[PDB]
Write a protein that binds this ligand. Structure first.
Ligand SMILES: CCCCCCCCCCCCCCCCCC(=O)OC[C@H](COP(=O)([O-])OCC(O)COP(=O)([O-])OC[C@@H](COC(=O)CCCCCCCCCCCCCCCCC)OC(=O)CCCCCCCCCCCCCCCCC)OC(=O)CCCCCCCCCCCCCCCCC
Ligand SMILES: CCCCCCCCCCCCCCCCCC(=O)OC[C@H](COP(=O)([O-])OCC[N+](C)(C)C)OC(=O)CCCCCCCCCCCCCCCCC
Ligand SMILES: CCCCCCCCCCCCCCCCCC(=O)OC[C@H](COP(=O)(O)OCCN)OC(=O)CCCCCCCCCCCCCCCCC
Ligand SMILES: CCCCCCCCCCCCCCCCCC(=O)OC[C@H](COP(=O)(O)OCCN)OC(=O)CCCCCCCCCCCCCCCCC
Ligand SMILES: CCCCCCCCCCCCCCCCCC(=O)OC[C@H](COP(=O)(O)OCCN)OC(=O)CCCCCCCCCCCCCCCCC
Ligand SMILES: CCCCCCCCCCCCCCCCCC(=O)OC[C@H](COP(=O)(O)OCCN)OC(=O)CCCCCCCCCCCCCCCCC
Lengths: 139, 171, 99, 175, 88, 120, 98, 347, 83
């Protein structure tokens, strides 16, 4: 989880350039994973078409992370409140707008803001209270 | 993890036997049946102590006792011994079945000049009650302490209090 | 096993081979029989959780025995330092290293 | 040279694996593994595994792969291929040896290869153990225990191989 | 030392012998699979000569015939149910 | 979990020490439920065979009911046994390590303050 | 972990990659399937022969006797698909689409 | 297949799987897996149709390598530990190799891709053995080595199993394909708690086996393989369709039906281990299973699809198969929920 | 018995091969039990030593083990000599 540590180590509301670049890396990293699978299960055309598919998938995933990290961090600076879960929501769903921008669909962009923002808010709660998704066997 | 202290070079100068394999194996049985006293407790040291370093004192004695046996032949029928061991080497397996006549010549000589009888079949392959002075090691493997086992389960069985106790199920 | 039928029946099916400190053909020892005896005797009736922390010194000594790793790190740096100290011409190897 | 015989055999093992796993024409692919089986014996022999290595020469290397060579005779493509015939197989061959070549370079420099497992690049001879084997030939008496200590392994080997013959002729029965 | 040296010189002479003479001038599959199974079962009883020197040869005795019986049994099935009789 | 407990003989459905517990009462409500389960199987059986569900083959239903009640009974003995076994070593464990279950210092409500929250 | 151990497991790793990189020939994949059990045999033998685990010499042969048994059925499986398709090409091994 | 040979071949699979659960040696665990693999291929090739050969080829190609991958972590664990006893793995990468190797023998993660088609290609009875008896042998190993498996790897693969299994069932027609996707979803359910508690994994196994075996081999009684074909069965045997809906609703897990037995107990254990987001999403995607469960019940008994005139012929005849152990198997797979304390018996 | 003896001779006429091997396997599997020498074979096999007969410390009252390799006490394989 080197990339995950790269993001979470940066304190909220500061070093926005580092937080953005970390956001691009995490968004970029998941771009390769989804594109490599897409090439595998669905065989593309000649290699230039394959990388064209790979480029599109990586571009959106990196773009969703890029803007999300920017706005999630500057919001803490501007609003002077890093702890609020809304600080991730306002940028967490803007990634859905970015997805809609690269897919050219108002409906899918708006719906993605409905969902991604909620999940991005939920991630902030997870770090705050101490939520664990893959909890170790305790009992 | 510590020190690997081992004996110096001082005690590692024994009068090493300068013979070869054929002459070693030509006698063999007679040497085994006449120098068992330093062989048995040294080998017993090798097994009980489980460490070469602690059996250096017995290690030199067996080599030294070999010389007394070996030079005893030189003051005796060593010429038949030379003819024997110079016929064993010629065989690639160093086998006795092709040198029976010299086997007799060595045996008949050693039978009366010294008296070392030929060890009968299976006599050497025998566990022996070798007398020894050293006490047995308290832990040959130098084992450390042992973890205390978990407390033993006991007590007469009692009915599960209030039954299954799983959600609303009773009895 | 899931259904340890060996324990109920009492007949040995594969336990003879499970470790190399059991009986072996004509008493041939394993390369690490001594450490197996120590680790196994250390960890019995202790459970699979307690033994992994308590009987660790025995395991560490044993886990080194099979694939001797730390001691080559000992040997590798011996070779590295010896090579460096002879390449520039300071340490002269003794004749016992040769004929 | 002579001191690196297990190392040199091991790297020929890899290049043989790279060549045949790159999937050339199947009859040529068999050869790529046959030499790998050939140099595989040397590693086993050099470590005292005289019987096990030689055993692999009779079965498998001189055995089952003959059937593989047999199978590629009647059930073959009309145009069997070669590393020149296709470009991807040519690229795979170069990639495998380059990856191997870059790896031994890493092994020879610092001997501190950490990829997946932690390896040491020292000489192959160090792992050997010093001590006489008496007269019993360790390996030879180890697999001779097949009938003294084998027990369960014997019946399951017999049964599965016997079950190996009910399955075969049944599937190639032609309805 | 001597083993691979012997292999090396044998290869060189054989390779030269052609070069000096080159520059200077379902049934078949079915039996093969049965061969593979029998040849593989043969690998089981190969270490028999050393196995005949154990201290419990009784267990060695009965189980050795068990492999040979099963080779006989596997042959028997492949025999009667047409099988080894080649397809037409 | 309690696989690996000291003394658990493998593949023993009912360990001998389980007999120290009170055996299930003859008409156990748990036991008679398996009698209901057996009865339904007989009723369902005739349905697939296209037979009078309530009247066809009283021999078939009798075997169905008897087997379910019987197999339930031993399963019901191991039922309470494991729960008794689970509670047994539990009760002894709290005594062997008193440090982790300390005395809960009982204090009446006259001491503890509960903050009141208006409901308007 | 010496180099001789490394070259074998790495050979297994590249053998594993080629096995699941099916080209247009099932025989080649079956051949690349052939790699690991030999790599497994070699890897097992060095471990067992080195450590003088006398009884464990069982398993190298035990590994080979059954790991070749799939090859017994696999080849007949290959000839079976080549008796209906007339070709070991794997692109036609997709009739189970729906 | 001559019945004597067919009976022996199933016995070998019976023996091969039984060997795994009774073995204490890592080799012997791999030993029976190979025998079990060696014996099923002829069973799958029961009709010798080209589709059956396709299914057998896919199953062999995805299982033989798993046994080969199985052996790989065995020697690596042997290399770093030196013991073949079935215990915790003392080397991390070996068990990382192990969990993937065992799972792809089974198929939960993308490894699962072979399960759908292979079930479809083979016969309905052959599909039963692959889907109700082949899930015990890998689970037997996972139960024994559950002490130290990496929780992150196992739970992720369990998530993907129920998420991919439920999602693919919605867009499936052949009842064999819905069976595979339903099984994939349930396998993640039973293996999700595997790192946490082993008893409720075996609980799910007995519960899942009973309903799956009952409703598979009841579907054999209907002699149907498509939703339309299953739809027609209401006119011939409306009792069969009525029983079909009961197990289908049990299959989803609606109380008080016994199919809610695993889903309830799993959520209880994961909650006990402070893992609470994990069950909720785990429970949520179970609705996907219910949807195509409910869709099949819609076309089976809850409505009446049009029949055919030629089907009046079938009314004059009757089935000949004796539905061995079928009738009792619905009863203990849809009504055994009040017998919930039986969990302790499995311990 | 007449037909069985006829059948065995019936076998030998139309085939001499597998009847001979069936006979060979039949005897080779049954004589092992009916043997006065298989006990000698295991006795001979164990008699041959491959390892050093590790001596035991003499704590007194050892009745049968010898102190000298030529001492009469201990196991003797003279039964092999005349064998
Ligand atoms: C957990 C709680 C639940 C489970 C509790 C335990 C019971 C499990 C079984 C439930 C009933 C299954 C059943 O039959 O449903 C009806 C249902 C209806 O089948 P069908 O349409 O009648 O067709 C059946 C055959 O295809 C017909 O093929 P055929 O016409 O060739 O006839 C062959 C048939 C009929 O038998 C014979 O032909 C007899 C052969 C005699 C010669 C050999 C003698 C020596 C061997 C004797 C063995 C006895 O024999 C077999 O199929 C052999 C296997 C069964 C006998 C051996 C069992 C293992 C020992 O059965 C099936 O769909 C097949 C079931 C196969 C067996 C079960 C496999 C999965 C088991 C999973 C759970 C295992 C326990 C987990 C814990
Ligand atoms: C079936 C024929 C083969 C098995 C029975 C005959 C051989 C028995 C045997 O070797 O037992 C060895 C052992 C009992 O050992 P034993 O006492 O015969 O010999 C021990 C020998 N040492 C000390 C060298 C190990 O039993 C088994 O292996 C039983 C295996 C299962 C048998 C039944 C299968 C069904
Ligand atoms: C706080 C730390 C993190 C900070 C940064 C924020 C997280 C990283 C950035 C956001 C990641 C999640 C959002 C989705 C990313 C991938 C989007 C993508 O691939 O879009 C392309 C495509 C959508 O279009 P498509 O479905 O292909 O249809 C049109 C085809 N012409 O879709 C595809 O091709 C793929 C299929 C659809 C998407 C499937 C799910 C992908 C995401 C999985 C979860 C990733 C979670 C990452 C964060 C947590 C873990 C680190
Ligand atoms: C864990 C990995 C699971 C992988 C499962 C692969 C099979 C099922 C998913 C699939 O085939 O594609 C999913 C994803 C999106 O597919 P997409 O590129 O949007 O194209 C859709 C129209 N064909 O395409 C992918 O390649 C994404 C797969 C990983 C998603 C996380
Ligand atoms: C938990 C939630 C609910 C779960 C269950 C829900 C079930 C219904 C769900 C909807 C199903 C789909 C829609 C309806 C489908 C109907 C299926 C069918 O086959 O219907 C027609 C069929 C005709 O009847 P037939 O098969 O001839 O049998 C008559 C009785 N011999 O009818 C039948 O085959 C029905 C046969 C019914 C047999 C009833 C037997 C009653 C036995 C009573 C025993 C009383 C004992 C009393 C003891 C007292 C002392 C203790
Ligand atoms: C000592 C007491 C016993 C003495 C011997 C008694 C039994 C004699 C058996 C003789 C052979 C079997 C019976 C017979 O006559 O079979 C004829 C038939 C020939 O078939 P074929 O020539 O191919 O013609 C087919 C088209 N008409 O036969 C066949 O096709 C069957 C051939 C089967 C061959 C099996 C070989 C197995 C290996 C050799 C035997 C090893 C020992 C087996 C165990 C023996 C135990 C006693």
């Amino acid at each position: 989880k080197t990339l995950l540590h790269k993001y979470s180590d940066i304190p909220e509301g500061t070093e926005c350039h580092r937080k953005a670049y970390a956001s691009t890396s995490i968004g970029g990293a998941t771009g390769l994973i989804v594109s490599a699978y897409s090439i595998a299960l669905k065989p593309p055309a000649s290699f230039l078409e394959g990388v064209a598919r790979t480029g599109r998938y990586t571009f959106t995933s990196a773009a969703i992370g890029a803007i999300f990290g920017l706005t999630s961090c500057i919001s803490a600076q501007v609003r002077e409140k890093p702890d609020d879960p809304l600080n991730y929501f306002i940028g967490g769903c803007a990634g859905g707008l970015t997805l809609g921008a690269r897919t050219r669909s108002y409906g899918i962009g708006a719906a993605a803001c409905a969902y991604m923002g909620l999940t991005a808010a939920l991630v902030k709660m997870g770090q705050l209270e101490g939520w664990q998704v893959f909890a170790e066997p305790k009992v | 993890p510590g020190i690997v202290e081992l004996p110096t070079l001082e005690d590692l100068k024994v009068q090493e036997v300068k013979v070869s394999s054929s002459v070693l194996k030509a006698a063999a049985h007679h040497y085994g049946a006449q120098c068992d006293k330093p062989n048995k407790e040294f080998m017993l040291c090798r097994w009980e102590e489980k460490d070469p370093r602690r059996c250096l004192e017995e290690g030199k004695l067996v080599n030294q006792c070999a010389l007394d046996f070996f030079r005893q032949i030189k003051r005796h029928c060593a010429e038949p011994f030379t003819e024997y061991w110079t016929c064993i080497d010629y065989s690639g397996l160093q086998l006795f079945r092709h040198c029976r006549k010299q086997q007799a010549k060595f045996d008949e000589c050693v039978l009366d000049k010294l008296g070392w009888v030929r060890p009968d079949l299976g006599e050497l392959s025998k566990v022996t009650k070798v007398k020894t002075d050293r006490p047995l090691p308290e832990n040959p493997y130098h084992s450390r302490a042992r973890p205390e086992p978990n407390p033993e389960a006991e007590g007469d069985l009692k009915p599960a209090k209030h039954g299954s106790r799983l959600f609303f199920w009773t009895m | 096993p899931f259904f340890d039928v060996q324990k109920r029946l009492g007949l040995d099916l594969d336990r003879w081979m499970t470790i190399q400190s059991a009986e072996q053909p004509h008493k041939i020892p394993g390369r690490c029989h001594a450490f197996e005896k120590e680790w196994i005797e250390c960890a019995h009736g202790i459970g699979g959780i307690r033994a992994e922390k308590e009987c660790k010194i025995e395991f560490d000594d044993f886990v080194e025995c099979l694939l001797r790793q730390k001691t080559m790190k000992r040997l590798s740096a011996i070779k590295r330092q010896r090579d460096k100290l002879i390449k520039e011409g300071k340490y002269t190897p003794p004749p016992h290293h040769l004929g | 040279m002579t001191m690196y015989i297990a190392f040199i055999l091991s790297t020929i093992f890899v290049i043989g694996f790279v060549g045949f796993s790159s999937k050339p024409s199947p009859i040529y692919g068999g050869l790529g593994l046959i030499v790998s089986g050939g140099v595989g014996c040397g590693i086993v022999l050099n470590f005292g595994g005289s019987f096990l290595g030689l055993m692999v020469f009779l079965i498998y290397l001189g055995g089952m792969l003959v059937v593989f060579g047999y199978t590629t005779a009647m059930a073959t493509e009309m145009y069997p291929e070669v590393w020149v015939s296709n470009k991807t197989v040519f690229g795979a061959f170069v990639s495998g040896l380059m990856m191997e070549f870059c790896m031994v370079y890493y092994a020879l420099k610092e001997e501190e290869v950490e990829i997946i497992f932690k390896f040491n690049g020292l000489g192959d001879w160090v792992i050997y153990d010093t001590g006489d084997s008496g007269f019993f030939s360790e390996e030879a008496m180890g697999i001779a225990a097949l009938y003294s200590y084998g027990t369960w392994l014997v019946i399951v080997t017999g049964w599965s191989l016997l079950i190996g013959v009910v399955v075969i002729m049944e599937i190639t029965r032609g309805n | 030392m001597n083993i691979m040296l012997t292999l090396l010189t044998n290869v060189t002479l054989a390779s030269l012998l052609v070069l000096i003479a080159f520059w200077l001038p379902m049934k078949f599959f079915l039996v093969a699979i049965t061969f593979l199974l029998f040849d593989l079962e043969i690998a089981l009883l190969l270490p028999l000569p050393w196995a005949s020197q154990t201290n419990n040869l009784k267990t060695m005795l009965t189980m050795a015939l068990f492999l040979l019986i099963l080779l006989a049994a596997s042959l028997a099935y492949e025999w009667t149910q047409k099988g080894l009789e080649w397809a037409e | 979990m309690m696989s690996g407990r000291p003394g658990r003989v493998p593949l023993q459905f009912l360990p001998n020490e389980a007999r120290s517990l009170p055996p299930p009462k003859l008409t156990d409500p748990r036991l008679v439920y398996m009698g209901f389960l057996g009865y339904c199987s007989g009723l369902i059986d005739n349905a697939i065979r296209r037979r009078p569900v309530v009247s066809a083959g009283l021999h078939r239903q009798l075997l169905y009911v008897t087997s379910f009640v019987f197999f339930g009974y031993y399963l019901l003995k191991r039922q309470d046994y494991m729960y008794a076994l689970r509670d047994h070593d539990m009760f002894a464990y709290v005594k062997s390590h008193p440090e982790d279950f300390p005395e809960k210092d009982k204090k009446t409500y006259g001491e503890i303050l509960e903050e009141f929250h208006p409901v308007r | 972990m010496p180099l001789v151990y490394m070259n074998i497991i790495m050979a297994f790793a590249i053998a594993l990659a080629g096995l699941l990189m099916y080209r247009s020939h099932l025989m080649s994949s079956l051949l690349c399937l052939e790699g690991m059990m030999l790599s497994l045999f070699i890897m097992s033998t060095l471990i067992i022969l080195n450590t003088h685990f006398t009884l464990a010499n069982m398993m190298p042969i035990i590994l080979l006797v059954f790991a070749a048994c799939e090859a017994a059925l696999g080849l007949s499986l290959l000839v079976m698909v080549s008796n209906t398709y007339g070709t070991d090409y794997v692109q036609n091994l997709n009739l189970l689409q729906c | 297949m001559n019945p004597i040979i067919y009976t022996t071949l199933i016995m070998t699979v019976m023996s091969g799987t039984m060997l795994v659960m009774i073995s204490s040696h890592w080799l012997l665990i791999w030993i029976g897996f190979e025998m079990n693999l060696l014996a099923m291929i002829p069973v799958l090739m029961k009709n010798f149709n080209p589709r059956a050969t396709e299914a057998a080829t896919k199953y062999f190609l995805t299982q033989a390598t798993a046994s080969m991958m199985l052996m790989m972590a065995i020697i690596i664990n042997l290399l770093y530990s030196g013991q073949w006893t079935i215990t915790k793995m003392f080397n991390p990468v070996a068990m990382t190799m192990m969990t993937m190797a065992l799972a792809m023998k089974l198929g939960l993660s993308p490894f699962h891709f072979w399960v759908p088609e292979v079930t479809q290609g083979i016969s309905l009875q052959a599909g039963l053995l692959l889907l109700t008896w082949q899930k015990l042998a890998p689970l037997s190993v996972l139960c024994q080595i559950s002490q130290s498996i990496n929780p992150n790897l196992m739970l992720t693969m369990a998530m993907l199993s129920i998420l991919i299994g439920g999602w693919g069932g919605l867009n499936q027609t052949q009842l064999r394909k819905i069976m595979a996707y339903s099984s994939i979803a349930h396998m993640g359910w039973m293996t999700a708690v595997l790192p946490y508690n082993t008893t409720m994994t075996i609980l799910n196994l007995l519960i899942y086996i009973t309903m799956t075996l009952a409703m598979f081999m009841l579907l054999i009684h209907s002699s149907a393989t498509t939703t339309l074909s299953l739809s027609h069965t209401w006119n011939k045997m409306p009792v069969i369709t009525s029983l079909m809906m009961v197990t289908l609703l049990s299959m989803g897990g609606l109380p008080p039906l016994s199919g809610f037995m695993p889903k309830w107990m799993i959520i209880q254990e994961m909650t006990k281990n402070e893992s609470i987001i994990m069950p909720t999403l785990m429970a949520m995607t179970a609705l996907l299973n219910l949807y195509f469960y409910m869709r099949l019940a819609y076309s089976s008994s809850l409505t009446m699809f049009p029949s055919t005139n030629n089907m009046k012929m079938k009314w004059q005849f009757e089935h000949t198969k004796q539905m061995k152990l079928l009738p009792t198997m619905i009863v203990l797979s849809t009504l055994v929920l009040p017998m919930t304390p039986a969990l302790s018996s499995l311990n | 018995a007449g037909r069985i003896a006829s059948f065995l001779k019936n076998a030998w006429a139309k085939e001499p091969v597998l009847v001979a091997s069936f006979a060979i396997g039949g005897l080779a599997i049954i004589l092992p039990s009916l043997s006065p020498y298989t006990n000698y074979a295991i006795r001979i096999n164990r008699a041959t030593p491959y390892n050093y007969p590790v001596p035991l410390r003499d704590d007194g009252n050892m009745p049968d083990v010898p102190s000298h390799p030529q001492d009469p006490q201990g196991p003797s394989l003279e039964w092999l000599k005349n064998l």
